[PDB]
Design a protein around this ligand. Structure first.
Ligand code: EFO
Ligand code: EFO
Ligand code: EFO
Ligand code: EFO
Lengths: 54, 74, 67, 42, 224, 68, 37, 74, 74, 74, 75, 75, 74, 74, 74, 74
């Protein structure tokens, strides 16, 4: 079929995606996740420290 | 009249490449924009509102040849 | 003399409750709305006026945008 | 042939998405923004 | 039922599939699937904040979002090979552009009445050419309308058809004598690069739509 | 000072202990799909690819219904 | 599910819907007058 | 015969690609405006009028091009 | 009859050189981008979209010509 | 008889695009003018008359081109 | 039909020199890249990817030209 | 014989676009003049003759082009 | 019948100036290659490989045209 | 016989705009001249003979162009 | 069959205008060479070889386009 | 057979504008040469032979072009 070559191109593209972009996007999301969670925990930690200092 | 339609078709053809400046002009505007904001950062929101206006005025006249090509195809 | 004896044990109970009730990695905004209607009220006023820009957010929380 | 078809279903979906987004999906994330900033500021 | 109507239902279902199943029971932590829409929201927010910069600027922030997502989604669904182009129809895209343009004109007329046509006099010009500068913009104001959509459609129509035509290329390249199977990989990588540029001509062109219509709302709401 | 104290004594007392959000048998013949692919733990893009296959099938079937 | 918020979609975006209806009516004229080609 | 109207169409085609120069020229005008204001912003208010001066009557010579096509189109 | 299709083909040929515009335009955009990030390493973000933005404005203009060729080719 | 006036029309067409030089240069003049006046503001009174000088005796030349078109149109 | 293929061939001829755009463009891109890496020694690995980015989808336009000159030539 | 006058007319048409050269040339000369006089305000009368000099016998050459067209319209 | 080969030959002739781009293009590269060492005599053996690589895959563009000319002559 | 002279005339027409090149090139010489003395006043004795030398033997190109055009005319 | 060699000739005519690119580029090479050696006269035996080699290698632009004519002439 | 000589004439007509770039290229060389000698006045006798060398072979492109025009005229 003619258009089957286009499906093969799409398969190769998504293979390259799952090989390169998927782990990079995973690492970016994990970095942002860790930053947000750490700041969210530090807010409550400083709140508890200021409550104990009172 | 199996001759004038071929001529108007090739006339839309020659009047298609008139957007050549639209391919070049707008770009060099952004060129200076990249040479403008990268030199002085804090003029971004001052040069960009007129940069998009220059783009609009550049694709305005860079498109009338293309609509001439449209209306000359039909 | 009793005011301090009450206010010290109040904060002591608060610290004893907060030490075992911090699910920060799994907290739900539904619980925050159930404890704080101020969240919903501020969201409602912010949408009605249109202050989609939330001040004091970009500094400690990065905008994370493409540009 | 299908000018009316495309255009009418497209405008239906346009009004649908306008109402849908503006009423549900922008403010549901604005809620997350406000919750994070309210836990930070306290 | 029409393939186009079913494609509209597909767009709506995918949009619902970007937030509803995304939200892990209303968690603050903001899971990975939510970070995509987080970034989209932030990059449209910090865009339209600095574009129109008005004291009351977020009021039109819903539309600048819903005009983007529609174009951001309807140009990523037809990316699947065995599908049909959604936005390549010049009629519908130009109609949407004309709708937005006429809406901006009516908004400006209802908000400023007579003085709304002060946009056509940008800055200080000498007298013997005061109407002249208005002229080009006079006709340019409505060329702004037809072009705004005609660009993206003429991109999408030029994109998918492209991925079709050169496809037949690699079809007409591998039915002549089998010796064509050797070094016959660079057209495959060329179609790969075509899809690479396709994804750009979808996403970055949606961005372009958003930024141009943001500038146009700025011009229609404020008088320079 | 007093403001942070009167705020955090109210913010903390109703907060649930830790974790605990299994929601019994969270299922409805579609919800499981979300628990398998759409939680903060898995969060893998596979469904997108899966959804792609859907169109890869759907239009093909539509192909199978129009041209062939 | 998703809590509904009463956000202004009519008292803000009325001219856009007006223009949409006007373009629908214009296309009605166009495809009822030029459909005989 | 049928040679007159065909040649009129192809002439309207050829006589429209001259806006290339006007488009490139207004583009470099905006480019110089950007390169100049980013170096010294406080002169924009003085140079921006003259700029849009230098814009207008630099496109006007290009604006004739499609006009010459128009009278040749009909 | 056997003259109009040959004319459509040669019109698709003549209208093909309209992509010259994009090839000249997007190039200087990337050139200015490289020059701006070269003399200012920590501004690339501020200028990364604004460059490629202009790309999608010039590239598209090129994407005009050949599609006008395509609807002239068929 | 019917062959010569169509050739005159297409001659006007081919000769119309000579305003390319005007559209480029009568704008490069203002581009350099802006680039010069931005880096040195107080020289406008020294240059601006001479500057506009460099416009007229240029654009008029380009005008000649298309007026030839008129004497080739009629 | 015995005449249309000659016009197809000359159309493929006129629709081949359009890679003038790519030939000038990728060249000036590499020229600016040379200038940048020269005036900034420690930026190469930062600009060369982007630069080669500004090659690939900067040359496809020219490709379009000859693929026209591939379809009107053969097909 | 009925083709020769139309040929002369289209020749006068094709030979008319040569003043593109003068139009760009005198313009770059005046551009450099503005760049020089704005960079050194004490040089005007020193460079003004040469500049306008660089004008005339440049554009005159371009003029020659279309005067060919003149002698190609009748002669 | 004698028109097809003459058309092939004039088509090989008209498609000659595509490498025109290379004719200028690659040279521009060496231009920067000279300007990349005048203001920086130190870095030579690092910019030279990049310059020759750019030369190679820019000349390739020049060719993709003269091999079309070759296979169209045949 | 009645076609060869018309061909000679249109050939003199198509061989005329080559002086285009000189028509631009020579000018930039004066440009550098103005860009040579504006920042270095006492340099005329060194640059002006060289400038006019270059001007003359570069305008010789356009001279040969239009004299080829004239000899092909007659 | 007298049309075929006439067509070969007229197609070789516009195959020699490929050195346009050479005529511009192999000249801007020496332009950059002069602009670079004047900034640092001491680096002459280092860049001149380099400068040339590019001239040789980049040349042939017109030479490989002028061969077409000759090949196309004979 | 009465067309081959007229075809040679008109092909010599469209083989003349190939020196186009020459008329520009070598010219701008002297421009840079001015920029070479007016910037560093202690380089005239050093790079003037280099300049005339870069001139000679580079103009040689125009030499080839017009001499092909001659040999096609006869
Ligand atoms: C072979 C491809 C090109 C380069 C390859 C290698 C050559 C080395 C290069 C540095 C030069 O040729 C050179 C400096 O080495 C060189 O020519 C020297 C040997 C020579 O002594 C030099 C000092 C010159 O004076 C020399 C440039 C000529 O004498 C000068 C009058 C003009 C140029 C000229 O006619 O040469 C060309 C040129 C080399 C060109 C370009 C040659 O070649 C000639 C012969 C081939 C055809 C006829 C070309 C036509 C051209 C217009 O395309 O003209 C050849 C005829
Ligand atoms: C073919 C793939 C490319 C490969 C890599 C690029 C560089 C080549 C490199 C490895 C060479 O060694 C070289 C460039 O360094 C080189 O030639 C030097 C070693 C050499 O000493 C140099 C000074 C020369 O003498 C050389 C310029 C020759 O004298 C000169 C006659 C070459 C002609 C020319 O234009 O070269 C091109 C070029 C190599 C180009 C580019 C070659 O190739 C040729 C032949 C193939 C086609 C015809 C292309 C493009 C066009 C002519 O169609 O032109 C080929 C014709
Ligand atoms: C080798 C070419 C040129 C010869 C000499 C060049 C350099 C030497 C230098 C000292 C010259 O005398 C010169 C630069 O001063 C010069 O050009 C003068 C003669 C010239 O008159 C100049 C001083 C002026 O007066 C100048 C301010 C005028 O405005 C200018 C329009 C003069 C006339 C002119 O351009 O005519 C040309 C020109 C002389 C040109 C110049 C010829 O000659 C004419 C002769 C007839 C034919 C038609 C040529 C063709 C044209 C394209 O060169 O044009 C001739 C018809
Ligand atoms: C290899 C090409 C050139 C040869 C040598 C180049 C470099 C060496 C250098 C020392 C030369 O002698 C030169 C630069 O000084 C030079 O060109 C002189 C001969 C020249 O006379 C120069 C000093 C002048 O007098 C100059 C001020 C004149 O105004 C100039 C119009 C001279 C005549 C001229 O251009 O004629 C050309 C030219 C010599 C050109 C130059 C030829 O030759 C002629 C010969 C006949 C044919 C028609 C060629 C074609 C033309 C396109 O080159 O033109 C010949 C017809």
């Amino acid at each position: 079929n003619d258009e089957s070559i286009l499906l093969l191109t799409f398969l190769g593209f998504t293979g390259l995606v799952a090989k390169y972009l998927a782990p990079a996007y995973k690492d970016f999301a994990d970095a942002r996740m860790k930053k947000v969670s750490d700041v969210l925990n530090a807010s409550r930690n400083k709140h508890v420290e200021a409550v104990k200092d009172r | 009249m199996q001759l004038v339609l071929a001529a108007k078709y090739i006339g839309a053809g020659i009047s298609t490449i008139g957007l050549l400046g639209a391919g070049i002009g707008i770009a060099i505007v952004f060129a200076a924009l990249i040479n403008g904001v990268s030199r002085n950062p804090s003029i971004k929101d001052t040069v960009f509102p007129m940069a998009i206006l220059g783009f609009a005025l550049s694709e305005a006249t860079g498109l009338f040849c293309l609509m001439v090509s449209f209306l000359l195809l039909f | 003399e009793s005011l301090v004896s009450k206010e010290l044990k109040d904060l002591q109970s608060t610290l004893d409750n907060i030490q075992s009730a911090r699910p920060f990695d799994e907290l739900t905004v539904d619980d925050l709305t159930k404890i704080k209607p101020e969240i919903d009220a501020k969201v409602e006023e912010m949408v009605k006026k249109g202050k989609w820009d939330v001040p004091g957010y970009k500094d400690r929380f990065g905008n994370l945008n493409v540009m | 042939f299908y000018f009316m078809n495309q255009l009418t279903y497209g405008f239906l979906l346009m009004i649908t998405l306008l109402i849908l987004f503006s009423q549900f999906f922008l403010p549901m994330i604005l809620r997350l923004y406000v919750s994070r900033l309210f836990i930070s500021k306290l | 039922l029409t393939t186009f109507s079913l494609y509209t239902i597909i767009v709506l279902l995918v949009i619902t599939s970007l937030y509803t199943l995304t939200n892990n029971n209303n968690k603050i932590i903001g899971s990975r699937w939510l970070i995509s829409q987080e970034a989209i929201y932030d990059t449209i927010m910090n865009m339209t904040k600095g574009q129109i910069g008005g004291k009351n600027w977020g009021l039109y922030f819903p539309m600048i979002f819903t005009l983007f997502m529609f174009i951001f989604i309807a140009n990523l669904i037809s990316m699947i090979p065995y599908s049909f182009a959604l936005s390549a129809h010049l009629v519908f895209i130009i109609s949407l552009s004309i709708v937005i343009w006429l809406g901006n004109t009516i908004l400006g007329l209802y908000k400023h009445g007579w003085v709304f046509f002060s946009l056509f006099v940008p800055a200080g010009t000498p007298l013997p050419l005061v109407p002249l500068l208005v002229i080009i913009e006079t006709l340019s104001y409505f060329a702004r309308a037809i072009s705004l959509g005609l660009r993206l459609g003429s991109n999408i129509l030029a994109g998918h058809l492209l991925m079709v035509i050169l496809a037949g290329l690699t079809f007409n390249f591998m039915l002549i004598n089998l010796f064509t199977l050797v070094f016959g990989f660079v057209p495959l990588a060329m179609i790969l690069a075509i899809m690479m540029l396709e994804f750009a001509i979808g996403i970055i062109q949606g961005y372009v739509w958003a930024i141009l219509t943001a500038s146009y709302l700025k011009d229609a709401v404020y008088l320079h | 000072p007093n403001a942070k104290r009167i705020a955090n004594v109210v913010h903390f007392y109703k907060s649930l202990p830790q974790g605990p959000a299994p929601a019994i048998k969270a299922n409805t013949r579609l919800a499981r799909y979300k628990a398998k692919y759409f939680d903060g733990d898995n969060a893998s893009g596979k469904p997108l690819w899966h959804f792609a296959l859907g169109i890869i099938a759907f239009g093909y079937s539509m192909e199978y219904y129009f041209h062939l | 599910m998703l809590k509904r918020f009463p956000t202004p979609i009519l008292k803000v975006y009325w001219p856009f819907f007006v223009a949409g209806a006007a373009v629908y009516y214009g296309m009605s004229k166009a495809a009822d007058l030029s459909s005989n080609t």
